[PDB]
Each structure stands twice: as structure tokens, then as C-alpha cells.
């Protein structure tokens, strides 16, 4: 719904994102959007992607850290 | 002896002002004729401050 | 949710919802204390170098041994929690010697580094289905400078988490972040041995609180021909004044 | 440029505030309704209020410094009256923004007690949240907050719609730690040749202020001896005085 | 806070705490001291005699001997002191059995330490609120030696040390009066360096001291109270000033 | 008491005092400490300076093996009384 | 209000007292009355049977029970902690004393071999 | 936006049945790197990608051999992959001693769905915060798999793990008709994975050092290709 | 103006100095803070064990300041009604501003500013609002001016979360029960007036630490003053002193009730 007033690539699987969230409120699900529509602009592009939605989600819960230590 | 938690403070705040009066600026500067006596049944419980 | 680190912190075996467990990431913070270390590798010679944190003028500073021998062709350093070292290295050498029985040869260097890293992992299951021996994952971050025939001169960084790396020019401990950028930009692949001992006796100067002398530092250098030796004081003082005679000109 | 090098977090801040007031031609045409509310949280000494007094400088519109002491008057249903009038004048004006501070006082949680002596202040905040998200009296007004206790405050004031964005002023890192010195050090008499990459390394996890005290007190120990220019040690002799040995790490 | 209960778990800094809290318990206990020259090593300990009913022939003497060529002191609490010795001397005596050459002192201290670094590994066990001082030569060598243990499980070599109460006074007193590159060279001098190291903190008593020295040829000896009063009083002349 | 003097001569009955009166070795709590602030004023009013026509306290209970002997300091209470059980 | 030195046993409180024992001794005082007094040429041991319902045969279970021919017992308090006790008390005559002395024991050495069967269960949580 | 209990051990349930510490384990993959796999009727393969610390530093192992008809590609917490390899290095060796047979790959994942469940029941232990693939060519054709800590495994025609992945799986959702008929020509199959993984990047440009490949086939053992022997596919 | 002053005390050298340069020089010698050219400190704290002269050291500096001064307790500034404190604290940090230069002195501030918790109650929070409006005044959006606070306390670690940091208090002073050599200067000024001329030999009267502050001194000079007088003798000997010293020290709790740590 909220993405209707946006640009958006045809790349995405909206159901996976539903699966990537647990115990959210619809208001957050909106703010997941703009933080993607915004972060697209910070990266310096115009259309919207998949992963741009993702780092919106981590921008919500204040993960806010790569935390690249010793994995892999 | 100055235990540290919630609603045993409401009397501590009634305790701490009095320590001022006995050795405040003014108290030490004023409490010259005023005088004091106090009693108890124990002194293993009080502050070391009084 | 803000209480993600506040509560999932202390038990080792608690995943936090960010995926990560913290009580290992704090072990990494331990070795940031202690006194610094450096390791530089070469086609000609591996070299180490440390400070010592002069604590009092009456101690006998040959005792605190931030650098050790571990076998005739390997040597270690460590910038971490002390007592948890001597539980490490009395295992690490024991493989190399044991290996000299079951296979009669100077062990490689990485396998040793893989035996250690399969020891700190005993707050859990090791490789071969073992169970446990501790609950305190310990900060002894090593530098294993060695030689073996297949691949020449090497070093490594062995961490408590188990995962390690074949760094070429590393520096760990308190003076790392100011150094490991400085060594980022002054490591050719065509240096000498003594084009490095002076180097590691220049970074160490600027990074450390006190001034530099022989007393507050030392270093070592293995070689395929001679072996692990910890250099001498008057030998080191040779290099220190040599440096100044290079700086002013 | 006077801030202590928390370079990222400002970028999440101003992107709320000024760009939807200067360059809306980007946010709108691509198709995004920008956010209209921030929150700031970090430990103290970290510069939550600093970056907020700043943006008033670069406002290009008004600003408000709400004094939280005027919302708790001792006559019922009064403070709430002050809340709604605070906004009736806002949307009258064009493109107002607002700076609360220490809303842990007002935006506290809720409960039920037959004593409940915080009963009244609850009735004030409800003048706020009903006013922020319901039946759009809002146009272009943004909001700004600040805390040191972001756990206790009620969920309603940290829901999107109200707070579409929040920011963690975590502690600094060594590199960013240095650019704090370069700010607070310019006015000073100091010799050329100190190396900050000790001072940072030797000041573990600590805050903007506890550095500003250090830059200072390196200067004070000069005055205790009537020199005229500082040194490199007097900084170090400050650190041991501020932060304030151990054998089981060497 | 929360991180200051157990042994298994770390701060978000790196500090492990309980070990740091034991060493606070050291400092609620009487002093001790250890000095070495070239032909001698010494040890001191300020005792008490603050009670009259207590019989004094078995006075509480910090000192203990592990073998002929080794001595010991401690600090902290004594309920644990009896343990480490009772495992230490066992180990020295189960060495020459197994090897017929007595202990290199560096072998001993790595077993008094070792029993502390096992009692800081697992919860369900407590550390030792204790901190030692070793003093003894090897067999067939002259080099005088001295270490200290510490419940962290570490140890270092020391030319002069003072631990227990008010040690932060006695150290700097010994940082002047010593010099590593010209030690005392006589068994009198270490004692005089050692006695007046106690006199800063000991209310000019002389019944409140014990000194015990050590030398080669498996030599050890405790000194006489009347042999101290003349090592005491003659100093007082030297501060007639 | 501010009124039991006023309408003197006067007396009191308390159908239960064992509730707020029982020996305790110490208080590791904030609430139960106020129970002492209750009692110590009750014990104070009789013994401190006051009138004499009040015979106020008639402490009722179900047992007597629990009270504070500091309440039983002679002057406070000196006439134990017992009734049948069965 | 609670005490936070009573939910467990191995914890001392500032009056140097332990937690759960003080309440077990109340578990019996809430229980039925039982006794036994003494004489010059014999000893008596008595109690009653507060039969719950009328339909419970009050004979299939004995408050009193034999330990040795010369020794008998009775409880007051909880029941299942009696018939589980005696079944491991009379044994201990037949295990610790009898077979290595031939004969049944005195009366007090039996007690020492009960009371540590009673104290094994107050030393570990 | 408040505390929850029931999220502190794998022993306990939610008030709905969601075991949590498994739902937090398999989030861990999302901050480990990418790696992908492909199948055909006659060949299997997988592509990986490295990450480092500083440009001096060496790169991190991402494929490890287990036996000459198997392999794996991890993505996650490595110390809990070092194990599982050294669990099935044994089983694959057990069989050759006792039965002299080749092990069935689909009775290896079944041996990993178990071990990752024992830790999941009882106090102590963790859910192995890893996610790893499997490959091989036993008698029943080529194979591939995709492990998770929960226990659940699946076989399929080629998948991806890790952060920045779904750009790949959308690709491999297209060409499933194609890259399975690809038989007897490895060197173009392998050029699909390298093409796939490039869909799911953020300005990395795919250096030689960053990459590592494994492959098997009809008669080709598990052989990996890292370094200067890989620049063919760039 | 209270008559106490420097040289009414001489027990110490540094703790006097480490705040004096915050508070008493900039009214005299500020060139030394502009040549070096920094932003000086404004606000300290002074804690420690009691009987050591905290409240004292305010009434000295307030004698020799040349600027105004304010004497307070943290308990004063909480009132029953809801929202009378938080505006009160906004008054005094107003009146001092306009009447610059200025000095403030809160004492036993652990009254109000000790620590925060969630506090499902209705009285504890009005204590917080004052604690929160105060720490707005001392440093927030708008600057305060030239107002130099001085706070006191007996137990920090059991209180004081964020009111104690730089920005608000730029240093922290430690008082403790004295050492030997300080006491040589303490009683000498308490006893610069009594006759006492006979036989005292003070210099081994107070030998060890003895767990006594400077305020156990004032009592002993007192009781041993009149204990002579009750013998109808004025000038004093040692017996009159030790007859007192045994009385004071008697009250001490058995600090070494342990004696477990030989
Ligand atoms: N990043 C920084 N760079 C420079 N100075 C800083 C920085 N952060 C904090 N300060 C110093 O701290 C003061 C403000 O700190 P901050 O904004 O964190 O206070 P605050 O967090 O609002 O206080 P409180 O938590 O009590 O509300 C400033 O006066 C400034 O001197
Ligand atoms: N060096 C000294 N010279 C003279 N008197 C001293 C000295 N040190 C301490 N005192 C004595 O200590 C007393 C003051 O005690 P102090 O002011 O420390 O109490 P306080 O803790 O400030 O009280 P409050 O906590 O209510 O402010 C004075 O009577 C003073 O005589």
C-alpha cells in the first residue's frame, strides 16, 4: 500500500519481508518504507531496490552497527 | 546507617536537614546558645554522622 | 527494543537478537589492555617487538616474558591476560614435540596455530566431539612467528574466538590502532631484516608513553639457519643509537 | 563544525529537519513522505544538546525551547492547555520545529495506583500524543527529543508517526576522539610537537566532556607552577587525575 | 552493576573482577618484606602481641619453610595459608623422589601459583586471599632468588618487595635506599635495610618483629629478640638528630 | 489520645494487637520498619508525660507468648489476664 | 514481608540462623498430638487417629511401629516422612551394629543412626 | 518495545511455540558473507566470497573438504563449522572402513539434522550459528543441500546464503530451465555462479583474491580453485 | 560573614588549593586563564568521610570572596505541591546570574540528587523533576553565566549518576581521615590559647592513624580543658589529655572485629 506512491523495481518478494519481521506494528511497516526510500537517496540513486528495504529495517530497530568481528 | 533504596529516603531527607542545622555555615555560626539532648536504647544502628 | 545488550551479555551461550554473543567480544577487549606487540615478516627474517611497561625500578625485568621460545623454529608473543597464557603455551609446544614423535619432523607453523585455536574453543565442543574444560574464554592474543619448508617465513594472529589470519605486518595490544595504520603504509614485499628492526624501533617510540631505551623494550628474530633468539640489551642499544644517527640526517 | 566529530549521526538528524524544508523537490518527486520526528538518546557527556543548539543556528525557520517546568502546574487540566496552545501558534507559523529535553519527566510510563500521585502528569502528555498523531492538525512541524533513560518512557511516544527516527549517540572512537581535541585546543598556548595519538589511545572509552576537561586541566597544572606554555606530560598528568597499578595483564 | 559477582564472566571492558577483589583482602593483613644482597636473603614480618593470655612460645609467625633451602611468607588470611604450604612442601618432596635433584625455585613458585590459577577457573570454587614471598637458593649455586605469587596466578622476580598493610609506604622507602647495581654485600646490611623498612609503620615497637634469613649449605635461622633490640636501638642513635 | 483525654475519663479496647506486635530480631525491609515507628509512639504516649485518668490500653489478643517484653516493662502493663479455652 | 534468608538452607542470616529448619519444626506443631512418658518398670507411647473419612479403615496403618523388640516409636507431624524413615532405621540396626556385634543395639546408638538419616536431608539444597 | 522473557534459553518456548534462540541464531548468517551453489544432472559447483580485516591480512577459509565425493561451503560462525566438518569427515571415513562404500550425501545431512537438535533440547550448549551447503556426486546423481541450525535440510537446484543474497535467488529463479541441462561442460556452469553472485554486491568488483570455487562432477573429485588459477572467469 | 577563615585550619595544603584556583583567583588573577587562554572551570564537589571539614571549607572561602554567596541544602528545595521546586531552582539560578559574580553551595545534595529509578509512585518523581531541572540549569540549551557551584556529600558511589560529570562539575575532591603530619598542625591551632605549658610532648600523643578525624580533636581539647577545671586547676598537663583520649576512642566500634587476616 504505502509503496504505491513511490518508484519501485519489480525485483522484490514482499512475502519474504513479512517473514523477516516478527512482532511489528503497521506503523513501523510504513516507516520501514521511507527509511528505504530515503536511504536509496543517500546512496545516490533514484529507483528503489530490495536491499534498500532491508537496511531500513535495521535502521528501525537501531541495530546501527555492522559488527564485523571474526565471523565467516 | 544510610541504606540506599526507595522509600526509606523520605525520612532520610528529614534526617539530613538536621545535620546541617547542627554544623551548617549558619548553625556553626549561630548555634551558640541553642543546645540539644537526645536519647536512645541502642547506638549500634545509627549513622556515624550524628 | 533497546535491552538487547543489557541482558544477553553475561552467559556465554546466549545469542542476542542481533545474532551475536557478547562475552567473546569482550574477551577481544582484554588484549587491548596490556602492553603492545608487533610482528613483521620478510623473505629474509621474521621479527617481533614489544614494550614492557616499566612498573617499578627494582623489579628484575627478565622475568615478565611477553616473548617466549616454543620450539627451535617458532616463537610467540602475547598482549593479554597473563595467567591464561601459561595454560596455552604449555599445550602449544606440547603438540610440536609430540609431533616430532608421531611424524619426526619440524612441524609446520599453521598446524600449531590450529591446535591452539582448537583449545580456546573448549567453552563448547572442540573438533573431536569433546565436551568442556573451562567457562572463562581468555585473552591471550598471540603472534606465532615461524618457519617451515612448504611456504617459508610466516606469522599469524591467533585469537580466542578460534579464527586466525596470516597477517604479514601486525601489531596488537594497546598501541595497535596508531601502529597498524603506520605499518599499513611502510611494508614493502622486498624489505630486509635490518630494514625492519629499525622500523619497529621507531613506531614503538612514538606510540609508547615513556621514551625509548633498551630497558623498556626488546625484540626477537627467528631464522631458518640460527633459530629463535631473544636479542641482548647491548645489542638492542646498538640499534637505538643507530636510529638517531639516521634521523637527524 | 564545532561538534566532536560524530559525523554520521548528524546526517540522520538534519535529513529530518532541514532538507524537507529546503529540498523537498527530491523527497516528493521520487515518492516519499519524509519523517517529521526524531529522538536522541545516548549516555551523558556525549553531545545530545550540543547538536540541537546548533541546528537553531542553521534553522532557516523558527525554533522552540520548551521549558518542561511549565507543564506541571498545580491546577488540573492546565498544563495540557499549554501544550495545545504551543501548537496552535506553531501551525499558524510556517515550518516550526521544537526541542524538548529530558522528556523522561513528562513522557514517563503509565500505571494504576489508588495513590497514583503521578496521575496528573499523565493527563498532560495525552494532550501531546493525541495532538501529534490524530486527524492531522499538523502540517510542517517537526519534533526533537532527548533522554538518558530511553527504556522507561511510554511506547506511544516512540512509535512511528510520532517518532519516525531515532539515533544512538554512542561513545566515540579513537579517530573521532582526536577531532574533539582539535576543537577545544585552538584557543590554547601549546608547543608544536605533541602527538594526540597517545592521548586518544590513553583515554579509553569516554565522552566529549571528559576530554574537554582534560584539554583544560593540562592547562591548569601549568598555572600551578607559573610556566607560560604547556607540554606533553601535563596532558598525561591530567589523565591520571581525571580517569584515575595492575599486574595481571602484562 | 552485575559483572562483579563471579569468575566466569567479563566486563564490557575486559576486567575480570573477583580476582581484583581478593587483593583488597591482602591489604587487610599484616606486612611482610623481602630483601636480597649477594651472600644473603632476608625476610621480615610485623606480628602482633596485643593479648596477654595468649601463650607466646608458639607466636603467630608468618614464616614457613618448604624445605631446608627454602622459606616462605604470606599475607592475607591464614586459614588458607596452611593449605598452600601443605601442598607446596609435598611437591618439593615428591620431586627429589622422582628426580633426586631438589627444586629449582622457579619450579616451586610455578606450583604455588598453579594451585591459585585452578581456583580461579571454575565457579563453585573460591580463590585464595593470599600473596606470598619465596626466598631460597638452588642446590649448588649462589645466585640469591626471590619471587612472589598472587591469586591472579602470576608471579615475577623482585630484588626487594613489601606486601601487606601499608606497603605503599615501604616500597618507595626501598626505592631510594636500594640500588640494583650495588646490593648490600653482608648479612648485617640487608637486615638494617630491612628493619628500618619496618620502622615507618610499627609504632617503634621491637617485640613486634620477626626476622628470618637464609644462606647456602641448606642454611636457615630465626633471630633472637635480644639480637633485634641492638639492631633496633642502634638505629635510634643514628636518628639522635 | 488527643481526644481520649478530652472526653476523659476514658478507656480504650483493641480487639487485636498481636498483629502489629511481635518480637523481631531485625528488619531487612522498609515497610516493617514503620511498624516499629507505630509501636514506639504507642509505648511512648503512656510512659511520657500525660494525664492520669486514662486507663486506655486494654490489649486483646489470642496469645501472649509473642509480645515484646519492652512492652511488658512494668508501668506499661502489669495485669495479665486469662480466659478459658475448653 | 519476606526475609531472603529463608528460601534456602546453607545461608546464614545476621543473627547466625538458618532458613528452613525453623519452619519444619512448625510443620509438626500444626500436626496431631502424640506423646510418651516414662515409669520405673516400663515406658508408654501413645497417640490417636484422626481418621479423615469414616470409610478409611484406621487399622491398616500404624502410627506406632517396631524398630527392635525392645524399641518402638511414634511420630507427630507428617506421615510419609515416617514410614520412609523407619524402613531405613531398623535396617541400620541390622546393618551397622547387629551383624558385627551379634545382638540388637542400645537405644541411643539407634538414635544416632536415625538422626543422621535425618541430617543427610538438611545439608544440601 | 519492551523486555521479553522466554528468550533466554533454547529449553523454553514462547507463549505461542516460537523457540527463540534458534530464531536468533539464523539471523547470525545475515552478518556473514555470501556463498552460492548450483546443480546439474552431472555436475555440482559452488561459489564463495571472502572478507578480510586489512589489506595486509590474509583471507578467510570459506570452503573446506570433507571427502572426495563431498564438500561444504559455510556462511556464519566458523568455529561451529570446523566442528561439523570434523564430524562428517569421520562418518564418511567410518563407512569406507566398515562397508567400503561411498556415503550417500542424503544420509549426511540427516546426520547433521540430528547433532544440531541435541544441543537444541537441553540446557548447556548453543544452536550452531552457521548455515552451510553440501555438494557431491554419488551414484544417485549430483546433489546439493542447504543446512540450517534448526535441523531442517533440503535438496534443490542451487541456492545462496548470507547477507546480500536475494539478488541472486531471483536470478536462479529465472534460469532453472537452463543450468541443469548443462552437462559435460563445467566451464560455463561455473560462469553462472560468478554471474549470479555479482547481482548481490555493493561496489566490490570481484577481485581474484576475494573469490574461491569448488567443483565436482561425473569423474572429477572435489577440487577447489582459489587465486591465480581462477582469473579465467573474470 | 562567618568569622572562620584560612589559618583557622591548617590541616592540609592541596585540597584547599585544588578548588581555590577554581573560585578565588579568577576574581583576582584571571590573566593567567586568558594568556594560556582557556575556558575555566565552574563547579566542583567535595566529598569524603565525615568529621574532616567539608562544611568548614565553605565558610572559609566565603569569608574572602568579594562576591555573593548562597547557603542551601538539597532538601530545602522540594515542596509538597506539584511543580513548586522546578520553578524554584529556576529562580536561584536566575538571581545569581543577574547578580554576578556568584557562588552557590549545596550541602548533602544526596537529599534529592542521588540516583534514578522507574518508581511506580507519585512522590519520588517530583524529586526527579527537580533533579532533572537542575541538571538543565547547570548546562543545557542556554548557558548559565558565571555561577560557581560547590556541592558536598558523604557517599558518592551510593548516589550521584550524571550530576557528577564535566560540563557541570569539572573536578572532584577527596577528603579522608588525616595522616600523622596533618594532625601536628590541627591541634596546634585548637591549642594555641590554652596554657598547657608543662610536660605534654604532643609529638607522640597521636602516634598512629588511630581512626580519628580532625573533629575528634576539638572534643579532646574541650573535655581535657574542663576536666582540669573540675579539679579547679586551669593550666593543663598530660594526664588531663589522656584521661580524655581514652574516653573518645572507647566509643569506636571494633573495626578489627575480624582479626582473621594474620
Ligand atoms: N561531541 C562533543 N564535542 C564537543 N563537546 C562535547 C561533545 N559532546 C559533549 N560535549 C560537551 O558536553 C556538553 C553537552 O553535553 P551533552 O549535550 O551530552 O549534555 P546532555 O547529554 O544534554 O546532558 P544531560 O544528559 O544531563 O541532558 C557541552 O557543553 C560540551 O562542552
Ligand atoms: N584541619 C582542621 N582544622 C580545624 N578543624 C577541623 C579540621 N578538620 C576538621 N575539622 C573540624 O571538623 C568539623 C567540621 O566537620 P565537617 O564540616 O566536615 O562536617 P560535615 O560533614 O561538613 O557536615 P555536613 O555533612 O552536614 O556538611 C569542625 O568542627 C572542625 O573543627
Curated annotation (Swiss-Prot), chain B:
Subcellular location: Cytoplasm; Nucleus
Top-level taxonomic group: Eukaryota
Post-translational modification summary for this protein: N-acetylated by NAT1.
Secretion signal, residue range per the UniProt entry: none
Extra remark beyond the main annotation: Present with 4700 molecules/cell in log phase SD medium.
Family: Belongs to the AAA ATPase family.
Function per UniProt: The 26S proteasome is involved in the ATP-dependent degradation of ubiquitinated proteins. The regulatory (or ATPase) complex confers ATP dependency and substrate specificity to the 26S complex.
Subunit composition and interactions: May form a homodimer or a heterodimer with a related family member. Interacts with OLA1, TMA17, and UBR1.
Name by which UniProt lists this protein: 26S proteasome regulatory subunit 8 homolog
Taxonomic lineage of the native organism: Eukaryota, Fungi, Dikarya, Ascomycota, Saccharomycotina
Gene: RPT6
Part of the full-length chain shown: 255 to 304 of 405
UniProtKB/Swiss-Prot annotation, chain E:
Lineage top rank: taxon: Eukaryota
GO cellular component: mitochondrion; nuclear outer membrane-endoplasmic reticulum membrane network; nucleus; proteasome complex; proteasome core complex, alpha-subunit complex; proteasome storage granule
PANTHER family per the UniProt record, alphabetical: PROTEASOME SUBUNIT ALPHA/BETA (PTHR11599)
SMART domains, A to Z: Proteasome_A_N (SM00948)
Keywords linked to the UniProt accession: Cytoplasm, Nucleus, Phosphoprotein, Proteasome
Quaternary structure (record): The 26S proteasome consists of a 20S proteasome core and two 19S regulatory subunits. The 20S proteasome core is composed of 28 subunits that are arranged in four stacked rings, resulting in a barrel-shaped structure. The two end rings are each formed by seven alpha subunits, and the two central rings are each formed by seven beta subunits. The catalytic chamber with the active sites is on the inside of the barrel. Interacts with CIC1.
SUPFAM superfamilies: N-terminal nucleophile aminohydrolases (Ntn hydrolases) (SSF56235)
Matches recorded under InterPro entries: Ntn_hydrolases_N, Proteasome_alpha, Proteasome_alpha-type, Proteasome_asu_N, Proteasome_bsu_CS, Proteasome_sua/b
Stated name of the protein: Proteasome subunit alpha type-4
Annotated coiled-coil segments of the chain: none
CDD domains registered for this protein in UniProt: proteasome_alpha_type_7 (cd03755)
Gene3D superfamilies from the UniProt entry: Glutamine Phosphoribosylpyrophosphate, subunit 1, domain 1 (3.60.20.10)
From Swiss-Prot, chain G:
Cross-link (Glycyl lysine isopeptide (Lys-Gly) (interchain with G-Cter in ubiquitin)): 108
Keyword match Nucleus: yes
Single Gene Ontology BP annotation: proteasomal ubiquitin-independent protein catabolic process
Main location: cytoplasm
Subcellular location: Cytoplasm; Nucleus
Record's keyword terms, sorted: Cytoplasm, Isopeptide bond, Nucleus, Proteasome, Ubl conjugation
Recorded GO CC terms: nucleus; proteasome complex; proteasome core complex, alpha-subunit complex; proteasome storage granule
Superkingdom of the source species: Eukaryota
Subunit architecture: The 26S proteasome consists of a 20S proteasome core and two 19S regulatory subunits. The 20S proteasome core is composed of 28 subunits that are arranged in four stacked rings, resulting in a barrel-shaped structure. The two end rings are each formed by seven alpha subunits, and the two central rings are each formed by seven beta subunits. The catalytic chamber with the active sites is on the inside of the barrel.
Function: The proteasome degrades poly-ubiquitinated proteins in the cytoplasm and in the nucleus. It is essential for the regulated turnover of proteins and for the removal of misfolded proteins. The proteasome is a multicatalytic proteinase complex that is characterized by its ability to cleave peptides with Arg, Phe, Tyr, Leu, and Glu adjacent to the leaving group at neutral or slightly basic pH. It has an ATP-dependent proteolytic activity.
Family: Belongs to the peptidase T1A family.
Protein's name according to its UniProt entry: Proteasome subunit alpha type-2
Name of the gene this protein is made from: PRE8
Swiss-Prot record, chain H:
Keyword Aminoacyl-tRNA synthetase: no
Biological classification of the source: Eukaryota, Fungi, Dikarya, Ascomycota, Saccharomycotina
Family per similarity comment: Belongs to the peptidase T1A family.
Subunit and partners: The 26S proteasome consists of a 20S proteasome core and two 19S regulatory subunits. The 20S proteasome core is composed of 28 subunits that are arranged in four stacked rings, resulting in a barrel-shaped structure. The two end rings are each formed by seven alpha subunits, and the two central rings are each formed by seven beta subunits. The catalytic chamber with the active sites is on the inside of the barrel.
UniProt protein name: Proteasome subunit alpha type-6
Localization (cell): Cytoplasm; Nucleus
Pfam families: Proteasome (PF00227), Proteasome_A_N (PF10584)
One GO term of the biological process aspect: proteasome-mediated ubiquitin-dependent protein catabolic process
Note from the entry: Present with 7210 molecules/cell in log phase SD medium.
Gene name of this polypeptide: PRE5
Function as written in the Swiss-Prot or TrEMBL entry: The proteasome degrades poly-ubiquitinated proteins in the cytoplasm and in the nucleus. It is essential for the regulated turnover of proteins and for the removal of misfolded proteins. The proteasome is a multicatalytic proteinase complex that is characterized by its ability to cleave peptides with Arg, Phe, Tyr, Leu, and Glu adjacent to the leaving group at neutral or slightly basic pH. It has an ATP-dependent proteolytic activity.
Organism field: Saccharomyces cerevisiae (strain ATCC 204508 / S288c) (Baker's yeast)
